[PDB]
A paper describes a structure:
The other three conformations, SD1, SD2, and SD3, all featuring an open CP gate, were refined to nominal resolutions of 4.2, 4.3, and 4.9 Å, respectively. In the SD1 state, we only observed ordered nucleotide densities in Rpt1, Rpt3, Rpt4, and Rpt5. The potential nucleotide densities in Rpt2 and Rpt6 appear to be very weak, suggesting either a partial occupancy or disordered nucleotide configuration within these nucleotide-binding sites. In line with the observations of disordered nucleotide densities, the Rpt2 and Rpt6 densities in the SD1 map, the Rpt2 density in the SD2 map, and the Rpt6 density in the SD3 map were of lower quality at slightly lower local resolutions than the other Rpt subunits in the same map, indicating that their conformations are destabilized, potentially due to nucleotide release. Similar to our SD1 state, a recent study on the yeast proteasome in complex with ADP-aluminum fluoride (AlFx) showed that the apo-like states in Rpt2 and Rpt6 allow the ATPase to adopt a different conformation when the CP gate is still closed. Although the AAA-ATPase module in the SD1 state was in a conformation with its nucleotide-binding configuration quite different from that in SA, the pore-loop pairing architecture in SD1 resembles the one in SA. In the SD1 state, the amino (N)-terminal proteasome-cyclosome-initiation factor (PCI) domain of the lid subunit Rpn6 directly contacted the CP subunit α2. The constrictions narrowed by the pore loops are substantially reconfigured in the SD2 and SD3 structures, so that the AAA channel is widened overall relative to that in the SD1 state. Given the similarity of pore-loop architecture between SA and SD1, we speculate that the SD1 state likely represents the conformation in which the holoenzyme prepares to accept an incoming substrate via the pore loops, and that conformational change from SD1 to either SD2 or SD3 might be manifestation of the preferred movement of the pore loops to engage an incoming substrate.
Numbering used by the authors:
A (entry chain J): 2 to 240
B (entry chain I): 4 to 251
C (entry chain M): 5 to 244
D (entry chain K): 8 to 127, 134 to 241
E (entry chain G): 6 to 244
F (entry chain H): 5 to 234
G (entry chain P): 2 to 205
H (entry chain D): 365 to 418
Write the structure that this text describes.
Amino acid sequence: SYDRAITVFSPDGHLFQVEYAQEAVKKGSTAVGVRGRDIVVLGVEKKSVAKLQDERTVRKICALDDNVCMAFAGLTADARIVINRARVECQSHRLTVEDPVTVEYITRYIASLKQRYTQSNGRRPFGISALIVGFDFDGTPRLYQTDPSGTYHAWKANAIGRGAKSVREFLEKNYTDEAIETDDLTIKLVIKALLEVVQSGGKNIELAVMRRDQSLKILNPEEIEKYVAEIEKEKEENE
Amino acid sequence: RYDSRTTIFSPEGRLYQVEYAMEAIGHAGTCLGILANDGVLLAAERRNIHKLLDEVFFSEKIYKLNEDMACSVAGITSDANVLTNELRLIAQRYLLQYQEPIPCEQLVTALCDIKQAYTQFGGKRPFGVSLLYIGWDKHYGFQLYQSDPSGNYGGWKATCIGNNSAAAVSMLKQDYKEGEMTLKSALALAIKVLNKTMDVSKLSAEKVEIATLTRENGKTVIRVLKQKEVEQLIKKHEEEEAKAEREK
Amino acid sequence: TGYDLSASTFSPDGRVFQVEYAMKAVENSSTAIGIRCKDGVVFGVEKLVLSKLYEEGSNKRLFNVDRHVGMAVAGLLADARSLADIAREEASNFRSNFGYNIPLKHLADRVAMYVHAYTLYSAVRPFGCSFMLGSYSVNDGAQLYMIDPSGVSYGYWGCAIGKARQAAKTEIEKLQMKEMTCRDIVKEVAKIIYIVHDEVKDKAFELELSWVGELTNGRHEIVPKDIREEAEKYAKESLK
Amino acid sequence: YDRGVNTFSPEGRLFQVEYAIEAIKLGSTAIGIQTSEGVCLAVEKRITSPLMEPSSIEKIVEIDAHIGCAMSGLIADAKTLIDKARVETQNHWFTYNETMTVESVTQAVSNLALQFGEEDSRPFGVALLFGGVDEKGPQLFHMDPSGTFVQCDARAIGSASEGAQSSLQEVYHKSMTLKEAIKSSLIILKQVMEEKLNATNIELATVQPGQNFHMFTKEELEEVIKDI
Amino acid sequence: SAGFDRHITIFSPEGRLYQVEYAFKAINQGGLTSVAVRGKDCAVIVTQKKVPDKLLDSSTVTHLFKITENIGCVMTGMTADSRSQVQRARYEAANWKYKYGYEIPVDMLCKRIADISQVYTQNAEMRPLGCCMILIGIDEEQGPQVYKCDPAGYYCGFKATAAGVKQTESTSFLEKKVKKKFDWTFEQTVETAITCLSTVLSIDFKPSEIEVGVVTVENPKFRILTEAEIDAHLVALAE
Amino acid sequence: GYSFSLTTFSPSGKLVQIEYALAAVAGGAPSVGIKAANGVVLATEKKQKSILYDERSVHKVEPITKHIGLVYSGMGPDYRVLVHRARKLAQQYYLVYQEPIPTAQLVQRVASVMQEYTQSGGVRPFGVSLLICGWNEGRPYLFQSDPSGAYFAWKATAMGKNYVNGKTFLEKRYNEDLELEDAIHTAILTLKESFEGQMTEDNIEVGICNEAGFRRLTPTEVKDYLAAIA
Amino acid sequence: SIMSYNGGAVMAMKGKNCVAIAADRRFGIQAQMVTTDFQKIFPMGDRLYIGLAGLATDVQTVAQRLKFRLNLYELKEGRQIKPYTLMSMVANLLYEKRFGPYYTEPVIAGLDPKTFKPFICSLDLIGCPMVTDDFVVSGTCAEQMYGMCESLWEPNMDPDHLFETISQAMLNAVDRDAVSGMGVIVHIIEKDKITTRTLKARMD
Amino acid sequence: ARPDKISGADINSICQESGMLAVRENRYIVLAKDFEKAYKTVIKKDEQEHEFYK
Amino acid sequence: NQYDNDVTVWSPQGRIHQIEYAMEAVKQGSATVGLKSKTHAVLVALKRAQSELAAHQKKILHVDNHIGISIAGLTADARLLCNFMRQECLDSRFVFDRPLPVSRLVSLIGSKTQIPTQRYGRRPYGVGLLIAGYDDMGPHIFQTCPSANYFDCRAMSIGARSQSARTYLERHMSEFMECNLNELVKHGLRALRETLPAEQDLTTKNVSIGIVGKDLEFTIYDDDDVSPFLEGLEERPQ
Amino acid sequence: ATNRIETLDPALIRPGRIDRKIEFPLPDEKTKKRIFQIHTSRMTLADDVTLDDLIMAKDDLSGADIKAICTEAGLMALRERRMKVTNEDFKKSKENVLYKKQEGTPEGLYL
């Protein structure tokens, strides 16, 4: 019983820092991710270019292997350390059994490390929640999410960061059965998610794709302008 | 209320010591580096300008770290020595392992991880020091970076130190330059920034410090320049002030 | 007081309350005395049965560390057992490394340093024990020692550890200790234990007598107290 | 006060273990019933979103080919304990060419269910139900965070366990049959749950001595649901 | 002031620390008086006993502790710290004799004991040895020496020396007494020691209370005096 | 009641258990050191508490090598520990390089030692500020450090009681170019400015640093010089 | 021998106001050569070279280790290194492997940083320094170079005669040598400039 | 030379202790032992004093 | 009351309240009674349950061929000391190839439990051992405590409301010594039936009896050799 | 009426005392327009803006947001001595009100 420390329970059976460390994620930048049937795609919002510096270093979407893709929320330093560890874990797994690394094993690694990191004596838990997207077994699209407690939790679409309830609520009203594939409709689905974002500034949108066989492709802020134009065309056709 | 250690969180989730480390940063020396191709610069303000020193070190904030990189520094001064010896050791380990100069980004992330390991672990004092980066590589050319006690690092082209440099960043945005790689132009711009931002009346050269880094034919030399060109830079900038009062 | 928590801190007047609280903890324990004669050392402990649940021969505070050295402890019993084990270990090491019997002063100094080191640090408490050390040697005679909870260890002729610490040595010092053999000192210790606290606060007690000296040829053991039965036929004559 | 695992109460007791027993209560419910025909077992999933894939959340896991499990509380402490049991079972088969019986499984788990210690970490926050078939027929086993392990004939855990045990002792006797106990359990489930019972809410795990393999029911559970 | 409740060894405001200067009267819980005298090629220690008891012995009560065959010392304060410091001094003098091949000078031992007390002071979490040690010794080419060791770790060494309980007065008398430039032909030293303690305490007592520790450049062996010769000196100073 | 102890920052300021250590340093014995053109002169202020104490036992001016002097203003028992550290460390340098260690390198490593002791959180820092000097490569140097692990370089400075007044006098009286003897004169002047007046061959203790090496002067030449030097 | 596994020959000769260092070019296994461009003379700062002969693995590893400690020393202290400092550093680096020794014979050749004072020294495989004034040699062939350099050296030598003397000595001693050959690199340095020449050797 | 911690009101009381002790001496003469008793009586805890760490 | 938190801190009255709190934690266990004859040592405990469907928690557990223990208090420390007990048995069984004397075993138990009562970082063990064994001098009934002051007796009883059991031992400790096994065991349960409230009766499923003899190996029983021991009784004198 | 609810007596939120606990969440992004309508119902304004531009700006919504927007727009109006408030007043008012105050905390954290 108190917000210190991590080790003792509440008198009604809670952990304060486990519950409180998710708030740092919940005040963090928004990053969504869906799975198609063949091409999986995701993206972050709030690029927030401050007019005088470069932004190629602030990239919140990366990869550990050619088959898996990353995202996170919360603070950036824990994401840096966890991904730098996870690359070496992926490569050590590759040094073992010669398969491409399954998404399930590396999510069990990351959440397990995060949890046994939390259980120890006075280590501040990683206030992040990762998005781990891959299509490995005959191109079966999978995306799991993490938690500061360290619970991998398999979804079909995902939304975190600021206002994640509303952004996930849009996918409730959007995600019918016949999404994909239909890759173009998955493209427009990512575009409608970016239009349903908390700010949807139009130029602060950064999205990355994976066709389950190719590499990670960073798009261009003219294709997305065409996507916003055809989405506004669909809104006018609704009228 | 929920103060005591660096670890664990305060319930927001916010932090205590990262914020207080930045507020430790703000009351320190002001430095800057500028947008320049074919070279890059560093500026620094002389703390403790009392007359009974020696200045036989030639360098008080600048540390020519590997061959082609220097670093300004700001904050608690002995922790800067602690980090700079280790950072030279990291760069020299990289050179030992590969026989190639370090391309500066993994160097920056390595130092950020060194700082971050003291952010998570407990109970240790995190380094209340931000510090700059100039350097050259085989992949991007001249570069600029901003280290932070959080472990976050920013690739800038016009950098930021604390309360004595928020107005400097405001002047850097309002007087932004792009396209001119002429180093004397950026040196005059930095002279203007330290003329307004420092409270030194008429900008005595003993209170300033300027170091540059140019690419010469294979060598990538670092120029800790002397005082007389600083003197004529001051006279040039004050002639530009006379040009400014031509509108009266 | 307050200011009384850790064993490493001092007081604003300069003493350690942990040492003091460890000292007066043994004050509540049972009375244990000792006295030597000109050719031996006699122990004796006022030991109490709880109500009817004991067995008269359990948990005897008269230990026996070495062939010629044994303890007469009082205080916390398990702490005394642990300290007895450390004494046995030290006597074993001396016997291993030097090939003869441990002199009692050196043994007392090593045990006193062990006690003192357990008074030094803050993670451990001071001991809650106070005990006796008796010995005999043909080249050294009888030596009777005494160890406080702090670690101040020096010698006596006679001692008492328990409630009636003052009230025993009130009349121990009127014993003519030098000119007597220890077989007289047996019934002396019997009358000393028997005079203090016959029936007052508690119900019943029980006597043990340890015994080392020239008569045992360097052995240290409990008397055959039942043999010659020195207490009760004198105790019934010591009530008048 | 009570502030840590290294301090008793003036009357008892921990006062950390008590808060772990309190932290049992937050979880979803689960019910297992021992029948000599075989051990049946059930759980609620408590699905939040339609995006939340139902077969991904694990409640019944497989430790041995004839040993099931069910978890109640913190997911990751349970995952650690399942990991250790999965290791230890295999070591027992390794060193003995035989199956570790489920009571001995539970002794092995409860050896460090309380080995909690930060120096010389915290106690765990999950209660576990073990179902299996040893040589003596089927076995149903109930442990706790405090390691006080005992056999139970039909134990219910988690939230709303009081009326679950009440209506369970209302309906239970020693000579039950299989499908009767299955429907009797799912009646109590749809009495303690808040949502409409369907194919995604619950899942069953049935182990039999002649049907040792596949301690699970997949979409025939729909047919079991529609018979009420 | 405090304020900080001075629990552990930290710096209090303006500017002091209180643990060691509480340990300065851990000597004063001893209830004892110690006097050292260096005038000429002899050196004299004197210190009383406090024995109220007839059941208590007389040989084992001595605080004159022979460190080595040419180095003796005397202790005050609480007895356990004193005896522990004595065994440490014995062990380190033996280590000197093993390593360096010759008998240790008296100064180096004081330096080592001061270093041990400083290390116990520098690092926390150990009680800092509240006992004061006074050393004497003969050195070649330097004559006699007297040194004092603090619990504070500040060793010093000088001619007329005293520590214990009542030695502000003893140092006052030795300021008034060692100012006249008389020679010290060893009975002068015995007389000044006995009379300075006999003016501080003003008891003029039996030869059975004080212990006299001497060392002289005619036999550099440390020497403890006997009852008969103490009585001989006492009636020799009786006028 | 905060800071307490060594693991956290303040809400806005600096480290209180460094500031109080500096306060205990400033509450120390006065001293002065002056870098001249040819040598550097160090001198202290050493009054015995009584007339009993001996002045051939404890020594303030202390050599680290044959060409490096070093004094302090603070607490002796910590002073000896860090000096012994510097001794062993300079000998390790002479083992590795077979060459006498430069004073800047000593200041680097001693500063690293002290900064390591200011690292969190179980020991206190030193109550010791240093004055390091030596005639390395012709040009003499003068290096003052502090318990925070930092260091400086002075022409002339002081440490102890009334160091601000001594500093104003050294700003006033001293200048860049003097000799060793003139530096000795103004050093005894600025020491006698703030000390008590009863100053003999024993109350002060002076070591100099020639280009011929370190030299720790004797009371013979001290009473030869300080017998009413002005 | 183990020293005669990859061959090797390093000659240094002290002139009047300058110093010259030369080595062979051949690299290969015991009788089978591989290449003609193997570096054994490494620049360590300005106007200060080092020569390494013996086992090539120890040569490259010791050269990189010395480069490591050299850069750390010259970046802790902004001045450049004196040659005696280098000699003590190399002796320490070798003597750390007292019982695990590297198999090399380092030769240091450099000038004074302040004056133009020349300097030569050579070391053993455990770190025994030795300063002379005429010449030091190392490698598999020894006695040939000893005879030639004791035959042709004069105390005060203009850089042209120093160059030609070390040229003829190296060429004749390498042509008598079997396992080391295939071209000669020559470094002649001085206060003004650094001259590097390659000689037309017998490629047999 | 004995610090610190003398207040101004204490001097005259020390002088009174010394003078009335000399009245008990039945002499008008102020010796040092008068000041000894005066220091020991009117100082009035604490004191040791010092000479450690300066 | 700020000093009543930790094991290391002495009280200003000198009584470590951590020890007495461990004693009170021991007093909340089950009832059990141990008593010996000259030839046969029998310890009898009481079982309890979580629910009606649940099994009964066993108390008497096997240790060795001539050693068996009762228990009251914590269960993790119970199995911890069980593992240590079995280890100390089989170690000397391996080295000396003899069965142990019981006294040195229980001294090892006290020395094992001393360190978690003196240093900081581990709580004292809430433990209720009653140990029955056979050395060369016959049966022994020892009892333990969290203060590691192990007691030798002839008849003890610890747990909740064990005082009536102790008075029964008082009024039959003269009678225990001569009888054979059967009425000795029914004396034991004529202590356990007074460790209960009188509005219910001691059943089968709640009791276990362990006999070790000078020629008989230590054996635990449950309902089946106990239904023979449960006959031969009268009702309580209501 | 409270801001937080977690630090309150469970004996005071029980019924008998209080029978109608009432949630105030920040309700919806649609009635943002109703508060912009009401708080500009009696001030002359041009068309020149869409409230959707002030719907897709910030994720937490309040009358404390919208009334601050209105008052700062009036400050920018009397700053530029106009009426019939145009779009640039809304844009600068938007940015200055979202900054003052909602950000948290100095960079960075998070980002």
